[PDB]
């Protein structure tokens, strides 16, 4: 289980959104459940009350595209600065994204490409999947 520790030791945090996406901060419960927080407009910052050993990840509010925080995937408050960045996406994932953002998901069938690129499009980024891919590591 990838969960927040229940330390009860307060920890002030700055979330700076150094990305062009509307960011959605996500806190993982003590039970492991992703809990969404109010969205951060692109370029903006926000002071946040959290706690030591708590767990956060960040995603594109609109498309759930993953983003990095302090170069890594997960952010855990210490004694704090949370800089939120685009990863260098792969050129393919980057392409899926634009296509996804230009095409209603019912119309993926109608586009002229291999069946396997159809299933790539449909396989939306998703927080639950990412927790599984990160729980194994």
């Amino acid at each position: 289980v990838l969960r927040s520790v229940n330390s009860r030791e307060p920890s002030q945090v700055i979330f700076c959104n150094r990305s062009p996406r509307v960011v959605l901060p996500v806190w993982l419960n003590f039970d492991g459940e992703p809990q969404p927080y109010p969205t951060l407009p692109p370029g903006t910052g926000r002071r946040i009350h959290s706690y030591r050993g708590h767990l956060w990840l960040f995603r594109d509010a609109g498309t759930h595209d993953g983003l990095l925080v302090n170069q890594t995937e997960l952010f855990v408050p210490s004694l704090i600065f949370a800089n939120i960045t685009l990863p260098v996406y792969t050129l393919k994932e980057r392409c899926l994204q634009v296509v996804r953002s230009l095409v209603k998901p019912e119309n993926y069938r109608r586009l002229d490409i291999v069946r396997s690129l159809y299933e790539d499009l449909e396989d939306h980024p998703n927080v639950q999947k990412d927790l599984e891919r990160l729980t194994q590591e």
Binding site: R18, L86, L91, R94, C95, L111, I113, V114, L117
Partner: peptide
Amino acid sequence: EIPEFPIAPEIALELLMAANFLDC
């Protein structure tokens, strides 16, 4: 801070295919 990789819509489909082929 990394900037976005811009992709014109006209070019998205073909770039996706090439991208997929080249594994990048």
